[PDB]
Amino acid sequence: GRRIQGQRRGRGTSTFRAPSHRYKADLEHRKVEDGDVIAGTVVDIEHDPARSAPVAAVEFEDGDRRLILAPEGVGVGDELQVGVSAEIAPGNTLPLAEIPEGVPVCNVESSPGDGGKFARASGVNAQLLTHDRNVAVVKLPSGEMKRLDPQCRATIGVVAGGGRTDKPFVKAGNKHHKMKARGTKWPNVRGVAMNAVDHPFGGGGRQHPGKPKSISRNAPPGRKVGDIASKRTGRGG
């Protein structure tokens, strides 16, 4: 048959790529020398076209101006701090070690100095639970308990723009405009609505998969479609 859609994706052609040239900033914690703090002032709040969430323009002391991942409740004129010694306030970035257990936190590094990885999307947060000289235990938005180096830096607060998904798109057009800002191919034709040549679920005199949807982890690309390595399906049971 022919390569399936998920196979076209990997080639990285225009249709599948993010509109990266229209994106504003790669949001990463600024680097501090060591054993220090550094302060900046929030100059502006703007829209982040990669995230559909707001972002804060900060002007730092050493003269550096950059966008940062903004938690809720940050505004123009606010002073923000980054470092070991920074105050504990929404918008400040500190190592997990210096943060009080029980404080909500965002833009958490997976490895120290990586700029941050976890809990970056609208309204989300990580919950810092446990300290140690060894390990910091963090609960991620998915609910997973994550053991992290205490030297991993996080930002205090929950990510801004919470409640984004509360409103229905209501119409195809609204989805459309969002999808233009993303690395996605849209709209979505059901495999079952295709010809056999085009998809494992394609073909037949009526629409139906014609094989179980739960597919093995070991299945090759072009065959791995439907419910991948599903531990269960449905609702009940």
Binding site: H47, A53, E72, G75, P90, P100, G102, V103, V158
Partner: protein
């Protein structure tokens, strides 16, 4: 009541129209500014809030200035002030 959802005519069904009205009603309510306390805060765009009075511009929820999550942050700090 249809609310702002009247712009939709007979389209889209009841849940979607109802939720868009409710969300947009609260979005368009008078909001008290975190700075000056006046009721002059409006939405500039997604998650972006501004006071027409003192000009303060700040981050908030997508459709409302303050979210339950964000309201918790402030508390969790003080609860950790005195261990």
């Amino acid at each position: 009541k249809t609310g702002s959802s009247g712009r939709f005519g007979a389209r889209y069904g009841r849940v979607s129209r109802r939720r868009v009205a409710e969300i947009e009603s609260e979005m368009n309510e008078d909001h008290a500014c975190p700075n000056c306390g006046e009721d002059r805060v409006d939405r500039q765009g997604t998650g972006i809030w501004q006071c027409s009075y003192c000009d303060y511009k700040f981050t908030g929820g997508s459709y409302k200035p303050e979210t339950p999550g964000g309201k918790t942050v402030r508390r969790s700090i003080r609860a950790a002030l005195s261990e």
